[PDB]
Amino acid sequence: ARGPKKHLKRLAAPHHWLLDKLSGCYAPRPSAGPHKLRESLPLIVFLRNRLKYALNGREVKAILMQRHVKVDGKVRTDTTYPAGFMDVITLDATNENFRLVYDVKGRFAVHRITDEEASYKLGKVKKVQLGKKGVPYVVTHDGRTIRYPDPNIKVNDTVKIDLASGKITDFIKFDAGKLVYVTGGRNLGRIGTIVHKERHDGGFDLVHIKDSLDNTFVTRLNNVFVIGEQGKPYISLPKGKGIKLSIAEERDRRRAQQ
Amino acid sequence: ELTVQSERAFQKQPHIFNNPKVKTSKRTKRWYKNAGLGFKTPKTAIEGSYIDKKCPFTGLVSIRGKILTGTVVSTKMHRTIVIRRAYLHYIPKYNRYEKRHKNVPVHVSPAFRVQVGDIVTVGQCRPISKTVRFNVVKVSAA
Amino acid sequence: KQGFPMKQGVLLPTRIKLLLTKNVSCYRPRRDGERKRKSVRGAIVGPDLAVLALVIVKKGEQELEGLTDTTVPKRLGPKRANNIRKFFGLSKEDDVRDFVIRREVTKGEKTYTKAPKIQRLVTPQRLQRKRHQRALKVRNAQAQREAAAEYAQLLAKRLSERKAEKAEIRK
Amino acid sequence: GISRDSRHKRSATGAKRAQFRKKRKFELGRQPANTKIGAKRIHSVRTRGGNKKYRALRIETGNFSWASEGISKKTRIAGVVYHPSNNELVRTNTLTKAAIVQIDATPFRQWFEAHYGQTLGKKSKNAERKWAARAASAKIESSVESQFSAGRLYACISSRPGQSGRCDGYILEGEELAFYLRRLTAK
RNA sequence: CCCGUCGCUAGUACCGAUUGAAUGGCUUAGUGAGGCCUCAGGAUCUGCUUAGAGAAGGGGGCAACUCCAUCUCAGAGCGGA
RNA sequence: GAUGAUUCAUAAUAACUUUUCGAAUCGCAUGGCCUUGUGCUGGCGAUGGUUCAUUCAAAUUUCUGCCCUAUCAACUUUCGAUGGUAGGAUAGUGGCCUACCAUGGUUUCAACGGGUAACGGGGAAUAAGGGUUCGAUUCCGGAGAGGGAGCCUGAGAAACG
RNA sequence: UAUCUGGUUGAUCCUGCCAGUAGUCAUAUGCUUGUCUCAAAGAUUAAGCCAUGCAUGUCUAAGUAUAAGCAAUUUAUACAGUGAAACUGCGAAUGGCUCAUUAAAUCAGUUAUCGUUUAUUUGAUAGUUCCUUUACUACAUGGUAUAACUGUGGUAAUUCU
Ligand SMILES: [Mg+2]
Ligand SMILES: [Mg+2]
Ligand SMILES: [Mg+2]
Ligand SMILES: [Mg+2]
Ligand SMILES: [Mg+2]
Ligand SMILES: [Mg+2]
Ligand SMILES: [Mg+2]
Ligand SMILES: [Mg+2]
Ligand SMILES: [Mg+2]
Ligand SMILES: [Mg+2]
Ligand SMILES: [Mg+2]
Ligand SMILES: [Mg+2]
Ligand SMILES: [Mg+2]
Ligand SMILES: [Mg+2]
Ligand SMILES: [Mg+2]
Ligand SMILES: [Mg+2]
């Protein structure tokens, strides 16, 4: 009531952060930023719970204030800054470069990338319109506004964003035979090529998708992120490559390496 | 359908201005739109003379949300009817069903003529009145 | 008596309770937008006062033993630059930085002078800041102009190739 | 104060609701403006989210548009002659939207002279070329030009004075003029 | 085969003539605090328009007469808060 | 250009405004080029600021779903009850309120009334299967700050440290 | 973990209830009580009443400092280190507590805003104002206050002034 909430209890935090239910009543509430607080990862939980570079939030603040970490090339000395999908995170001490991509279990992965790849990111366009004085713009999935885009860029395409400038390098359209990333829903983390999309005028366009082992599935168009053509992706995929082995095959694979 | 101009105010479509200087055929500028979702705009809306601000075709409302179907049980209001949606409600203990119903007050345009017993399909709009949130988009029975 | 102050403009000799706000005497608000009903005495002098506050506007003949004999100097001099220029009756070019009043203090045998910081003083840094702002405006205006011109030639190229394909259409 | 909610009314079945909640601020309502004529007096209202709102009380002039002529002039308001909601607003001379008023009409006749060179009712070469070129558009209507002889035009208020502060309008024309004329001349 | 009237003891509810006091939801008529919007009101404070009158200093007299004046008396004003 | 769909985005014209905003702000570094003036020029920030988008939200809202009771069968409607037209007010939609008009709206498929030792849900206990009883209480939503009503400030309160 | 048994008769078979039997993040109470881990806890009656104390404040290289504060200098006679007060700016609308009200209300799942407000965050974004536009002027930078302070006081008393 009476205004915006500022706390976030543990057991209400998103489950993919993997915060243990003991050791505290509260979870780090993500501050307002480029990503929605459910589909986000604060820098405190990334630096402490995923990389183990700190033991406390106090140590995460001590890391942040000497301007070590920067996210998408900007410094961001904020504890609960929402780092989201496709953000690059640079740790100049250790010269490390991460990209936030999902593993197939549905959680954010520690995906180390090279220094050439940290110079860009992909963004899914959410709307194209005309701003004031008739200047067109696009809005990517992390809320970046890019003026004077290519006229061929319609919605649900991916644009390659330069991250030194905010300029657009190239772009991938939306049709059949395109490599997609599922970000959202039950199938979160899977990679498959799009076979066809269902019109459904009035709400919730569906799209059918099959992975490399020929397992089909279907997803709403809200959760699909095109990442290239079949064969080459435009980014480096994490380990596993979005395959979704069943639990039978998973314990068989674990009993191989054990 | 005997006069248009019955009220104390001048009934007219907003921002549709007919220039008194010119003299053509096609007597007045009439704004109409297609409501979408495959519903056909009726010719009585396109060619008529009624004003009907809450019309889904000539008026300032938009259809978005649920599309429902009912049977007309009342026409005694002015430009408003009450439809009856009948459904079966399942009770899990006895493993069977029961007849239930709701009454939905819907707005009806003068493009459409309904009587009691007709089946209509209605489209959700913004709140029209205290109870009305739905608007007739196709009358296709008798 | 009973310690209540006098408010100007009440125009009656008894007390009455007023809903008081900020920027109004006899009340200091403890919260933003807080108003408070306080009792206050009127502006008409009656026998009920304990103290009357008086100000001398024009000296008589004798010297009062408390009042016109002794002096208090004002506690601080002017601090803003044109305030100093009005205090000394200066002119625009005078280099006011030397007319600053310095108060000597001794904590010990040491003495030091602790003049104020002149405010709203012209300085090379303010001129650099103004030059930077006026430069940043023209730089953004020129940048937007080349972005618009490049997009317009892109549209011209696309429309030309669309017209060439439309030339391939229709025989 | 004035509440804008629906929980205080009866249900559609006709039942009396119980008091679920005290009156919330995001459902408030405010007293009316009742904008009179003369000696302009605009108060401000602080509304939700900052977002100032101008209660005009007692407005004097307005900007009125001639739609067939495509212009608009700042004209003085004489008085309200018709209101479709209430006759007491016509009596008390309140200015709301959809009020039929009388306006001064002298800027419109000055523009019509300066634009077309013919006077309504009853020198240089450049002006002669301009006035000859836009000929056969200086024959506006009979009803409006008879008002121009009488120096008072019928206008309709298209602005909301209690919300914006302004009392804007358009000159009545055509079939809408005939409708309100039958309303006015009705005994 | 131990109960229909009448009788003893204990308990439990009911009807109570009783014009007895105590609560409470509504409801009839009459008043109605407070803030808020509004019609006025104008303690006070202040900014500029005249310069008639009142102590010293320059351009002609190096002897009443023309510009700044330290400040008021105020009327020939406009405001604003 | 977009949408299933708009009088949409955006652009243009004519005016309006009681005239909004369009940097008199702060810290470090102190370079560059000169006809050498305290000349012109210039880095990384901090705070502010109009509009759009984004995020954190909010306010309304569609469909369906709630315990016992007929020793509750008719309820609502001069004082809005159901709808129509205009206005007003609101951040906005709407009987939300006003003016005029029409006579509607709910109900045995249980309306309306009464009772609840009734905050709702995730859930708990006990169960072969089906069920029955509970949920003030670790999370989500609501409400309240002795009882009522009114308001200031603010983006956000009908706020009770 | 798909189970029953005692009681109507002189005996019998039934209907049928009573009684036993097992559990309870159901309470209470009695008797008894060595150790390790883990843990609810003024809900029910009285959303009855409250002595006392605490629970909301906040400073960076970066808004304002002549504390008649403390320090040591040696850059710096305008300031420049640390730092009370006070002004300004944000915050105090989150959290915590309780369950009185409330029965299509709240709530749950599912929709909508093409029907709206949104501090903050993040990304974009403002050559047009010399308002009568040859200077009527300050743009190498314009005007007032006022706090803290200093001093004089009132009231039995207050976070009064
Ligand atoms: Mg936070
Ligand atoms: Mg016997
Ligand atoms: Mg309306
Ligand atoms: Mg209505
Ligand atoms: Mg209760
Ligand atoms: Mg209880
Ligand atoms: Mg709770
Ligand atoms: Mg509350
Ligand atoms: Mg209490
Ligand atoms: Mg209160
Ligand atoms: Mg308290
Ligand atoms: Mg027997
Ligand atoms: Mg026996
Ligand atoms: Mg038993
Ligand atoms: Mg709370
Ligand atoms: Mg920004």
d(CA C41, C1' G158) / Å: 18
Give the chain D residue nearest B12 (alpha carbons): D176
Residue of A135, A137, A148 to mutate when probing chain C, most C C-beta within 10 A: A148
Measured over the CA atoms of residue B60, residue B64, residue B67 and residue B73, the dihedral's sign is: negative
Whole-number Å distance between alpha carbons of A239 and A237: 7
Cβ-defined contact of D6 to B130 (cutoff 8 Å): yes
Helix, strand, or coil (residue A253): helix
Is there contact between B and D if contact means ≥3 C-beta pairs under 8 Å? yes
Whole-number Å distance between alpha carbons of B123 and B136: 6
User: What tokens were used for A147?
Assistant: 């003026």
Helix, strand, or coil (residue A230): coil
User: What tokens were used for C76?
Assistant: 């601080």
User: What tokens were used for D18?
Assistant: 């119980």
Whole-number Å distance between alpha carbons of C161 and B42: 41
User: What tokens were used for D103?
Assistant: 């306006």
Exposure of D29 by Cβ count < 10 A (0-12 exposed, 13-18 middle, 19+ buried)?
Answer: exposed
Q: Which of D68, D98, D183 sits opposite B21 (nearest CB)?
A: D68
- Percentage helix, strand, coil for chain A under 3-state DSSP, each rounded to 5: 15, 30, 55
Whole-number Å distance between alpha carbons of D37 and D33: 12
d(CA B71, C1' F102) / Å: 24
User: What tokens were used for D91?
Assistant: 């009596």
Whole-number Å distance between alpha carbons of B87 and B99: 6
Q: Break chain D into its structural domains and give their ranges.
A: 1-30, 31-105+152-187, 106-151
Whole-number Å distance between alpha carbons of C88 and C100: 10
Please report, as a single letter, which amino acid is at residue A168: I
Measured over the CA atoms of residue C65, residue C69, residue C70 and residue C74, the dihedral's sign is: positive
Q: Which nucleotides of F are covered by protein (CB under 7 A)?
A: 1-7, 9-11, 13-18, 23, 25-30, 38, 40-45, 51-66, 75-76, 80-100, 102-113, 130-132, 138-145, 149-160
Please report, as a single letter, which amino acid is at residue B52: D
C-alpha distances out from residue B82 to B76, B77, B132, Å = 9, 9, 10
User: What tokens were used for C116?
Assistant: 């104020």
Smallest CA–CA distance, residue B83 to chain D, in Å, is 15
User: What tokens were used for D119?
Assistant: 């006077």
User: What tokens were used for A191?
Assistant: 């990679």
C-alpha distances out from residue D169 to A148, B11, C12, D40, Å = 40, 17, 51, 17
- Within 8 A of D183 by CB-CB distance, chain B residues are 8
For A199, half-sphere exposure in the C-beta direction (CA atoms, 13 angstrom radius) is 2
B93 touches chain D (CB under 8 A): no
CA of B92 to the centre of ligand 14 (A): 29
DSSP letter assigned to residue A9: B
Helix, strand, or coil (residue A15): helix
Beta bridge partners of A97: A90
Give the chain D residue nearest B105 (alpha carbons): D12
Whole-number Å distance between alpha carbons of C14 and B95: 83
Nucleotide nearest to A29 (CA to C1'): F56
Beta-strand pair D61-66/D153-157: unpaired
User: What tokens were used for B32?
Assistant: 């109409």
Beta-strand pair A88-91/A82-83: unpaired
- Within 8 A of C157 by CB-CB distance, chain A residues are none
- The count of other CB atoms within 10 Å of the CB of residue D144 is 22
C-alpha distances out from residue A100 to A86, A166, B58, Å = 5, 19, 50
Residue of D4, D145, D179 to mutate when probing chain B, most B C-beta within 10 A: D179
Q: Measured at the alpha carbon of residue C125, what is the angle toward residues C123 and C126, in degrees to the nearest 5?
A: 75
C-alpha closest to that of B123 among B56, B78, B59, B54: B56
C-alpha distances out from residue D119 to A124, A149, C47, C139, D138, Å = 64, 55, 79, 54, 10
* Secondary structure (H, E, C), chain C: CCCCCECCCCCCCCEEEEEECCCCCCCCCCCCCCCEEEEEECCCCCCCCCCCCCCCCCCCCCCCCCCCCCCCCCCCCCCEHHHHHHHCCCCCCCCHHHCCCCCCECCCCCCECCCCCCECCCCHHHHHHHHHHHHHHHHHHHHHHHHHHHHHHHHHHHHHHHHHHHHHCCC
Give the chain A residue nearest B67 (alpha carbons): A202
Contact D119, D145 (CB under 8 A): no
* Distant-in-sequence, close-in-space partners of D102: CB < 8 Å, separation ≥ 6: D77, D78, D79, D81, D152, D153, D154, D155
Taking the C1' atom of F13, which residue's CA lies nearest?
D70
Strand E within 7 A of C16 CB: no
C-alpha distances out from residue B95 to B89, B90, B91, B140, Å = 11, 7, 6, 35
User: What tokens were used for A160?
Assistant: 């390659």
C-beta within 7 A of nucleic chain E, residues 29-48 of D: 31, 41, 43
Beta-strand pair D169-171/D61-66: parallel
User: What tokens were used for A255?
Assistant: 């009993």
Give the chain C residue nearest A151 (alpha carbons): C155
Helix, strand, or coil (residue A103): coil
* Distant-in-sequence, close-in-space partners of A27: CB < 8 Å, separation ≥ 6: A8, A9, A10, A12, A13, A17, A19
Helix, strand, or coil (residue A116): coil
Whole-number Å distance between alpha carbons of A78 and D30: 43
Whole-number Å distance between alpha carbons of A122 and A149: 15
CA of A190 to the centre of ligand 14 (A): 59
Whole-number Å distance between alpha carbons of B17 and B39: 28
Contact D23, D41 (CB under 8 A): no
Contact B74, B108 (CB under 8 A): no
User: What tokens were used for B125?
Assistant: 């709009």
CA of D21 to the centre of ligand 10 (A): 13
d(CA A11, C1' E7) / Å: 78
Measured over the CA atoms of residue B87, residue B91, residue B92 and residue B97, the dihedral's sign is: negative
Beta bridge partners of D47: D50
Contact D109, D148 (CB under 8 A): yes
* Distant-in-sequence, close-in-space partners of B57: CB < 8 Å, separation ≥ 6: B32, B33, B34, B35, B41, B42, B45, B46, B109, B111
- Within 8 A of C151 by CB-CB distance, chain A residues are 148
Residue A12 φ/ψ region, left for φ over 0, alpha for ψ in the -120 to 50 degree band, beta for the rest: alpha
DSSP letter assigned to residue B13: -
C-alpha closest to that of A177 among A192, A190, A189, A160: A192
- Within 8 A of B18 by CB-CB distance, chain D residues are 174
Cβ-defined contact of C148 to A148 (cutoff 8 Å): yes
C-alpha closest to that of A194 among A213, A174, A223: A174
Measured over the CA atoms of residue A214, residue A220, residue A221 and residue A222, the dihedral's sign is: negative
Ramachandran angles phi, psi of B47, nearest 5° = -100, -10
User: What tokens were used for B106?
Assistant: 């819907």
C-alpha closest to that of B10 among D97, D142, D91, D151: D97
For C30, half-sphere exposure in the C-beta direction (CA atoms, 13 angstrom radius) is 1
Whole-number Å distance between alpha carbons of A115 and A88: 11
What is the signed CA dihedral for C92, C97, C100, C105, rounded to 10 degrees? 180
User: What tokens were used for C167?
Assistant: 């030339």
Q: How many residues does chain B have?
A: 142
* Secondary structure (H, E, C), chain D: CEECCCCCCCCCCCCCCCCCCCCCHHHEECCCCCECECCCEEEEEEECCEEEEEEEECECEEEEEECCCCEEEEEEEEEEEECCCCHHHHHHCCECCCCEEEECCHHHHHHHHHHHCCCCCCCCHHHHHHHHHCCCCCCCCCHHHHHHHHCCEEEEECCCHHHHCCCCEEECCHHHHHHHHHHHHCC
Ramachandran angles phi, psi of D14, nearest 5° = 105, 10
**Complete DSSP assignment for B30-82:** ------STTPPPPHHHHH-----TT-SSSSS----S-EEEEEEEE--SSSEEE
Helix, strand, or coil (residue A158): strand
C-alpha closest to that of D103 among D184, D29, D185, D170: D170
d(CA B93, C1' F119) / Å: 27
User: What tokens were used for A99?
Assistant: 């990209």
Helix, strand, or coil (residue A221): helix
C-alpha distances out from residue A229 to A167, A173, D105, Å = 22, 10, 70
Smallest CA–CA distance, residue D113 to chain B, in Å, is 18
Q: At what angle do helices D106-116 and D143-150 cross, to 10 degrees?
A: 120
C-alpha distances out from residue B106 to B52, B81, B134, Å = 14, 6, 5
CA of C23 to the centre of ligand 11 (A): 30
Is there contact between B and C if contact means ≥3 C-beta pairs under 8 Å? no
Q: Which nucleotides of G are covered by protein (CB under 7 A)?
A: 64-66, 68, 70-72, 77-80, 91-96, 101-106, 111-115, 117-127, 140-144, 148-151, 153-157, 159-161
Gyration radius of chain C over CA positions: 35
Q: Which of B5, B9, B19 sits opposite D68 (nearest CB)?
A: B19
C-alpha closest to that of A89 among A69, A62, A116: A69
Residue of B6, B10, B51, B132 to mutate when probing chain D, most D C-beta within 10 A: B10
Taking the C1' atom of F1, which residue's CA lies nearest?
A129
Exposure of C51 by Cβ count < 10 A (0-12 exposed, 13-18 middle, 19+ buried)?
Answer: exposed
Q: Which helix (H) or strand (E) holds A137?
A: strand A136-139
Exposure of A21 by Cβ count < 10 A (0-12 exposed, 13-18 middle, 19+ buried)?
Answer: exposed
Contact C42, C6 (CB under 8 A): yes
Q: At what angle do helices D174-185 and D143-150 cross, to 10 degrees?
A: 60
C-alpha closest to that of D61 among D176, D167, D175, D135: D167
Cβ-defined contact of B8 to D98 (cutoff 8 Å): no
Contact A204, A198 (CB under 8 A): no
**Complete DSSP assignment for A22-89:** SS-SB--PPPSSSS-STT-EEHHHIIIIIS-S-SSHHHHHHHHHTT-EEETTB----TT-EE-TT-EE
Give the chain B residue nearest A201 (alpha carbons): B37
C152 touches chain A (CB under 8 A): no
B16 touches chain A (CB under 8 A): no
C97 touches chain A (CB under 8 A): no
Contact B124, B65 (CB under 8 A): yes
Q: Å resolution of this model?
A: 3.0
d(CA B87, C1' G102) / Å: 29
Whole-number Å distance between alpha carbons of A174 and A177: 9
Please report, as a single letter, which amino acid is at residue A167: K
Beta-strand pair A136-139/A127-130: antiparallel
Please report, as a single letter, which amino acid is at residue B131: T
C-alpha distances out from residue A45 to A50, B120, C114, D154, Å = 7, 55, 51, 70
Cβ-defined contact of C148 to A147 (cutoff 8 Å): no
Gyration radius of chain B over CA positions: 18
Whole-number Å distance between alpha carbons of C152 and B32: 35
